[PDB]
RNA sequence: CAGGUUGUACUUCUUAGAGGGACUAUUGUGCAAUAAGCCAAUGGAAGUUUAAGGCAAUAACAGGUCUGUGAUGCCCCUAGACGU
């Protein structure tokens, strides 16, 4: 037969509050894996786990460092390169620097005036993105000196929910057709994508509904799209006149990643998470609600907590998922069964 | 363990200014017509509208004060005056 099992494999209990934010390290030596992860919960803090070594006490990991910072919630996690620094948005209106060996932020990025939704950071880790309710995408310098704000002209309707930046190919070859950028989505449903010195490269109105999150393939090739739409929309750096591929995820879309290699998109929605693939043309070839650890307090049943998180770690084998609880499920995948 | 210093060092304690934060939130019975809402549990600094107060409608009590008033009507006293 040949099939996908979603085999689990543990939870990660620490979180008060909703799970924002998830990151896993990167590889630091050419596809090994990395045994650093990284989350950012509403309870304000961000967290550093200790995972663990084929782990079933029925746990996979446990809290190594808690972060206490921001003065609210933790909207999202960009990791440096090495596994060492990260920053934190939070709508408390400031940014977070978090040597990771340290429980200290050695910079606070104050400037920005509404909550924050969202941390970009850039492959030559000199530039921080962040975007939030102000509508303006703001360029940090790795001290804190805000530097540029992205335009009226430039920005769009609503609030900004997620920026992000292409990723960079390694072999100086002369590289795609296209340069890197950084795309940013807006809730009132519209895609952007920046030519490297803040100017429009491209606006199209993706959804009707607000836009939650937004995710690059490794390629810098694609980029996948979902919110109250209800529906995930990926689309070509090139012909744009419409998107690569549409798929129809049960309720609404949270965060959408995919895979670090594999080459499958999983989309973090209300129900749980659905992972489909582009290989095909199928419609959802895998797919996990399993929500229910809290939701065994005698009497006290919380059916579906929504997922607020997806990251899978270095290689693409686990994937993490944030829920309402606070709690982060991992799921491996097992094919070629029966 | 007390004492003296010193550092363009720090804020947990103290001060006080900005801003957070609860809204009845999440879960299940009663209500249930849909309801407004009521209950219990959990989380919570905080759930009796969080606690304690301020403000206080229309009428009216012929309530009380002319001894708080240079707020006054009328009536009283006026130089052996109730003035001083
Ligand atoms: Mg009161
Ligand atoms: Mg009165
Ligand atoms: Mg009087
Ligand atoms: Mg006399």
Redesign the pocket.
């Given at each position: 037969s040949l099939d996908i099992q979603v085999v689990k494999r543990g939870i990660l209990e620490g979180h008060?509050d909703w799970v924002t934010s998830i990151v896993a390290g990167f590889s630091q030596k050419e596809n090994e894996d990395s045994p650093v992860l990284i989350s950012g919960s509403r309870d304000k803090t961000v967290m550093i786990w200790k995972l663990y070594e084929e782990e079933q006490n029925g746990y996979f990991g446990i809290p190594h460092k808690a972060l206490t910072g921001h003065?609210?919630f933790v909207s999202d996690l960009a990791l440096s390169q090495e596994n060492c620094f990260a920053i934190s948005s939070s709508?408390?209106?400031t940014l977070r620097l978090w040597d990771l060996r340290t429980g200290t932020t050695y910079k606070r990025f104050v400037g920005h005036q509404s909550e924050v939704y969202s941390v970009a950071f850039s492959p030559d880790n000199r530039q921080i993105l962040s975007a939030g309710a102000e509508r303006e995408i703001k360029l940090w310098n790795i001290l804190g000196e805000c530097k540029f704000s992205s335009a009226e002209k430039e920005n769009h309707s609503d609030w900004v929910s997620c920026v992000r930046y292409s990723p960079i190919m390694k072999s100086a070859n002369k590289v795609q057709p296209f340069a890197p950028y950084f795309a940013s989505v807006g809730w009132d449903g519209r895609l952007k994508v920046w030519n490297t010195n803040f100017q429009i490269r491209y606006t199209f109105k993706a959804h009707e509904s607000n836009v939650n999150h937004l995710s690059i393939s490794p390629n810098g090739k694609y980029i996948a799209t979902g919110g109250k739409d209800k529906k995930l929309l990926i689309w070509d750096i090139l012909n744009l006149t419409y998107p690569q591929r549409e798929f129809d995820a049960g309720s609404t879309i949270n965060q959408i990643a995919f895979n670090p290699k594999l080459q499958w998109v999983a989309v973090g929605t209300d129900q749980g998470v659905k992972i489909f693939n582009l290989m095909t043309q199928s419609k959802a070839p895998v797919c996990t609600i399993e929500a229910e650890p809290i939701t065994k307090?005698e009497?006290?049943?919380?059916?579906n907590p929504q997922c607020t998180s997806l990251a899978w770690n270095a290689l693409g084998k686990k994937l993490f998922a944030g829920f309402t609880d606070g709690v982060i499920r991992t799921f491996s995948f097992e094919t070629s069964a029966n």
């Open positions: 008060s003065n609210h709508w408390d209106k307090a009497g006290q049943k919380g059916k």
